[PDB]
Paper text:
The 70 kDa heat shock proteins (HSP70s) are an abundant family of ATP-dependent molecular chaperones, involved in many cellular processes including protein folding, prevention of protein aggregation, modulation of protein complexes, and protein transport between cellular compartments. HSP70s bind to extended hydrophobic sequences in newly synthesised and partially folded proteins, in a manner dependent on a cycle of ATP hydrolysis and ADP/ATP exchange. HSP70s consist of a conserved N-terminal nucleotide binding domain (NBD) with ATPase activity, a substrate binding domain (SBD), and a poorly conserved C-terminal domain which terminates with an EEVD tetratricopeptide repeat interaction motif123. The two main cytosolic HSP70s are the ubiquitously expressed HSC70 (HSPA8), and the stress-induced HSP72 (HSPA1A)3.
The difference in affinity between 3 and 2, between adenine and adenosine, and between 8-aminoadenine and 8-aminoadenosine illustrates the importance of the ribose group in nucleotide binding. In addition, we found an intriguing difference between the HSC70-NBD conformations of the adenine/adenosine, 8-aminoadenine/8-aminoadenosine and triciribine fragment/triciribine structural pairs. In the three structures with the ligands without the ribose, the phosphate-binding loop 2, which protrudes from the IIA NBD-subdomain and is one of two phosphate-binding loops characteristic for the actin ATPase family, adopts a distorted β-hairpin conformation similar to that in the nucleotide-free HSC70-NBD/BAG1 structure. In this conformation, the peptide groups between Gly201 and Gly202 and between Gly202 and Gly203 are flipped relative to the nucleotide-bound conformation of phosphate-binding loop 2. By contrast, and to our surprise, in all HSC70-NBD/BAG1 structures bound to carbocycle-containing ligands and small fragments, phosphate-binding loop 2 adopts the distorted conformation also present in the nucleotide-free HSC70-NBD/BAG1.
Numbering used by the authors:
A (entry chain F): 150 to 260
B (entry chain E): 0 to 381
Write the structure that this text describes.
C-alpha cells in the first residue's frame, strides 16, 4: 500500500535523522572532553573549573535536541503510514536517549 | 560603500518589532535575516558576544539571566514606578536602581554590566536599521518610530534617545493607534470628523484607543486596556486543558516535566494559529511523557469555550474607552484590528456583534499595521 505521499514524510524524517547525527557528534566530543579532564593531569580543584567551562556547550546541545523534538512534533502521519510512524517513534526515542546522556553530563559539571 | 536609501517606519514593540518601507506605491514589510517579518525585542549577553533579535530569543533557555526583553515596559520610567516594581518580579534578569533610574544588570564577557532601557532599545533599533539595509542594499538613517498613545513625556523622550543612540535620524514619533489609522488611510476619507476605535491585542498587551480625525488632525480621546493580556493567556488555557486530558486518559501528571510541558506548549501555540483558519487542529507528540504517545485534536469551539471569559473580557476595555471619550458605540466610524491575537475569529465576532454587524479594518496583517502606518508617515516626511 506504499504511497508516493509517504515518501515526502520519510524524506522529512531522513533530514531530521541527519540533523540529530550532527548534534550527537557534538555530544560525543563533549563526552571525550569530560572524560579527558576526569582522567587527566589536573589536580581535583583545577578539574572542577575545567569541567564547568563545558556548561555552555552542553546547554546548546540540549537546546538543539529540543528544537528537533519540536520540529518532529509538527508532523501528522496517518495510521496507514506505518513506516513513517515507526521512523518518527524511533527518532524521538533516539533523541530522548541522547537528552538523558546530556542530563548525566549537566549534573556532573558545575556541582 | 552603499548608496543612500529611503526613510523607514519602525514599530518598536514590547515583544516584537517590525520595519516597513514605502516603495513602488506600496508598503513592504521587511523580512529579517531569518526570513521573519517581525523581530523579537530581545538582547542577550554571552561570555563571547552580544545577540539581538531571533539569535537572542533562540538562546533564552540556555542563558535566561543575561537575555533582556520587555525594555519597553521600563523605558522612560523611574525605578520606583509601580509598573517597574510589579514587572521585575517576573523577569529572570536583574533590574537595579541608579540614582532613581532603572538599569538592566547582566553578565557580559565575564564582567558585570548595566544598561539604561534606551540603550537596550537602541540595540533593537540598530538591528531594525540593519534589517532594512540588508533588504534595500542601501544605507538607512531616517525613520519614524512609534510609541503607545499613553506614553508620557519621559517615555517619549527616552524612545527618541534610543533612536539617536542607534544612529537613526528620528523624523517623527507617532502614536501606535495613529499609525494603525494612517495604514488604513482613515485620515483621507471624505466627510465630517470621524471617530476611530483601535483594537490592539498583540505583543503581550491589550490596548484600546479612541481617536477623532478632523481635517486630517488626530486627537487621542481615550485609552483603555489590560497591560499583560495576550496570546500567551490563550495558550495557557490550551496547555491546562491538555494536561487535564493527559491526567484523565493516562492517570499521569506531566506538569513537573519542563520538557513535556514545553513540547505541549509549542504544539498548542501552533494549533491555536491553525484554529484561526481551520475548525480543527490535530497534535501528534510521540513519547510525550513516560514513553506515552499523545495523539489528540482540539476544535475551534473547544478553544473558544476554554477562553470564553478572556475573549468576552476584551469588550470591557472598549466600553471603558467609549465612556471616557464620551461616545456611544453607534458614533464609531471605523474599527481597526491590530496585534496577532485579533486573527482569532471569536474575537472578531464579539467585536463586530458589539458594533451591530459593522465591518472591521483587518485586511492589513495585524502584527504589521503599526509599522505599515509608520512607513507611510516616513515617506510623507521624506
Ligand atoms: N501572531 C499571531 N498569529 C496568530 C494566528 N494566526 N492566530 C491566533 N493568534 C495569532 N497570533
Ligand atoms: Cl522583504
Amino acid at each position: 500500500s506504499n504511497s508516493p505521499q509517504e515518501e515526502v514524510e520519510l524524506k522529512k524524517l531522513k533530514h531530521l535523522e541527519k540533523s540529530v547525527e550532527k548534534i550527537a557528534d557534538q555530544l560525543e566530543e563533549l563526552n571525550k572532553e569530560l572524560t579527558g579532564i576526569q582522567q587527566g593531569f589536573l589536580p581535583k580543584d583545577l578539574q572542577a573549573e575545567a569541567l564547568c567551562k563545558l556548561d555552555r556547550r552542553v546547554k546548546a546541545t540540549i537546546e538543539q535536541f529540543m528544537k528537533i523534538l519540536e520540529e518532529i512534533d509538527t508532523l501528522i502521519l496517518p495510521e496507514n503510514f506505518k513506516d513513517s510512524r515507526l521512523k518518527r517513534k524511533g527518532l524521538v526515542k533516539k533523541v530522548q536517549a541522547f537528552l538523558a546522556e546530556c542530563d548525566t553530563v549537566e549534573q556532573n559539571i558545575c556541582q | 560603500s552603499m548608496s543612500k536609501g529611503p526613510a523607514v517606519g519602525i514599530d518598536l514593540g514590547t515583544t516584537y518589532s517590525c520595519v516597513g518601507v514605502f516603495q513602488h506605491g506600496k508598503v513592504e514589510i521587511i523580512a529579517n535575516d531569518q526570513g521573519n517579518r517581525t523581530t523579537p525585542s530581545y538582547v542577550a549577553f554571552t561570555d563571547t558576544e552580544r545577540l539581538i533579535g531571533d539569535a537572542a530569543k533562540n538562546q533564552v533557555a540556555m542563558n535566561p539571566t543575561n537575555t533582556v526583553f520587555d525594555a519597553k515596559r521600563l523605558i522612560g520610567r523611574r525605578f520606583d514606578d509601580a509598573v517597574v516594581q510589579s514587572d521585575m518580579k517576573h523577569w529572570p534578569f536583574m533590574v537595579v536602581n541608579d540614582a532613581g533610574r532603572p538599569k538592566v544588570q547582566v553578565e557580559y564577557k565575564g564582567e558585570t554590566k548595566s544598561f539604561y532601557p534606551e540603550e537596550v532599545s537602541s540595540m533593537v533599533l540598530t538591528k531594525m536599521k540593519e534589517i532594512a539595509e540588508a533588504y534595500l542594499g542601501k544605507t538607512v538613517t531616517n525613520a519614524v518610530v512609534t510609541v503607545p498613545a499613553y506614553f508620557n513625556d519621559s517615555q517619549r523622550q527616552a524612545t527618541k534617545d534610543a533612536g539617536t543612540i542607534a544612529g537613526l535620524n528620528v523624523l517623527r514619533i507617532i502614536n501606535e493607534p495613529t499609525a494603525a489609522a494612517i495604514a488604513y488611510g482613515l485620515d483621507k476619507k471624505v466627510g465630517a470628523e470621524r471617530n476611530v476605535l483601535i483594537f490592539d491585542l498583540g505583543g503581550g498587551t491589550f490596548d484600546v484607543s479612541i481617536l477623532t480625525i478632523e481635517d486630517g488632525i488626530f486627537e487621542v480621546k481615550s485609552t483603555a486596556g489590560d497591560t499583560h493580556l495576550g496570546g500567551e493567556d490563550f495558550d495557557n488555557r490550551m496547555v491546562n486543558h491538555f494536561i487535564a486530558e493527559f491526567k484523565r486518559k493516562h492517570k499521569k501528571d506531566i506538569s513537573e516535566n519542563k520538557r513535556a510541558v514545553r513540547r505541549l506548549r509549542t504544539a498548542c501555540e501552533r494549533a491555536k494559529r491553525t484554529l484561526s483558519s481551520s475548525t480543527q487542529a490535530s497534535i501528534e507528540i510521540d513519547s510525550l511523557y513516560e514513553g506515552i504517545d499523545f495523539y489528540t485534536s482540539i476544535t475551534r469551539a473547544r478553544f473558544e469555550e476554554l477562553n470564553a471569559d478572556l475573549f468576552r473580557g476584551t469588550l470591557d476595555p472598549v466600553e471603558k474607552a467609549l465612556r471616557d471619550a464620551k461616545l456611544d458605540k453607534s458614533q464609531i466610524h471605523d474599527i481597526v484590528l491590530v496585534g496577532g491575537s485579533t486573527r482569532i475569529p471569536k474575537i472578531q465576532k464579539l467585536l463586530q456583534d458589539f458594533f451591530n454587524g459593522k465591518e472591521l479594518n483587518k485586511s492589513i496583517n495585524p502584527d504589521e499595521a503599526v509599522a505599515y502606518g509608520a512607513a507611510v508617515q516616513a515617506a510623507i516626511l521624506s
